[PDB]
Amino acid sequence: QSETGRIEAFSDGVFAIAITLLVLEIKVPQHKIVETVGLVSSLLSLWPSYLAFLTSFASILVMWVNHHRIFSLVARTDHAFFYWNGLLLMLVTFVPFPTALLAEYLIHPQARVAASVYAGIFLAIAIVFNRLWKHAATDRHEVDAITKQYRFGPGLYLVAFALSFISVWLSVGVCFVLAIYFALRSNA
């Protein structure tokens, strides 16, 4: 109630502000570039910003859903529970930077780093979801599905993290499709 409802309320606000801050990274094309190539070729060349904004928005929504699900189940709060949640908020607000980094350097040669730090923050959040839930355990079917799912995540985002080093396109691809899949298995 107050102990858990206050924490879940605060977390909901920080999630909302993180999600909406994503738009700011999308920068209107400069007057110079549009003057030489046309506003259209410019707004088009902005496609990885759209891509990064979109997949990152989507993934953060999934995080809001999972966060609410965990919070509905048990009402005891621990000191370390409060702080594991606090890190989770921290990585959520941090997501805009790897997003912006990724949109800025997706086409360019050192893109593999951009992709890796991106999948990094996502894997890192996944690990933190997993640890956050691990503290609670230590509806049977919901608990089981949740334990099973949060142990299923960090590995797959580790797969995205590792895939980054081989090629950018493959890593960003598995983050997009992985956002669709995790959205689907998240149970709204």
Q: Classify 73 as helix, strand or coil.
A: helix
Q: Is 20 in the site for a second copy (CB under 8 A)?
A: yes
Task: Tell me which stretch binds a second copy (CB under 8 A): 78-86, 123-131, 144-152, 155-163.
Answer: 78-86
From the list 22, 52, 132, 146, which residue makes contact with a second copy (rule: CB under 8 A)? Answer: 22
DSSP string, 30-85: PHHHHHHHHHHHHHHHTHHHHHHHHHHHHHHHHHHHHHHHHHHH-----HHHHHHH
53 interacts with a second copy by CB under 8 A = yes
Contact present, 119 and 126 (Cβ < 8 Å): no
Question: H or E stretch including 111?
Answer: helix 111-137
Asked if 51 interacts with a second copy (CB under 8 A), we say: no
Residue closer to a second copy by CB (options 56, 133) is 56
Give the Cα-Cα-Cα angle 94, 100, 105 (nearest 5 degrees): 135
**Out of 52, 63, 70, 89, which residue is the one contacting a second copy (CB under 8 A)?**
89
Using CB under 8 A, which of 54, 107, 170, 177 touches a second copy?
Answer: 54
Q: In the complex, what is the shortest distance from the CB of residue 154 to a second copy, in angstroms, rounded to a whole number?
A: 21
Instruction: Please state the closest distance from residue 173 (CB atom) to a second copy, in A.
Output: 20
Q: What end-to-end distance do the CA atoms of the chain give, in Å?
A: 22
Stretch that binds a second copy, among 1-9, 136-144, 147-155, 160-168 (CB under 8 A): 1-9
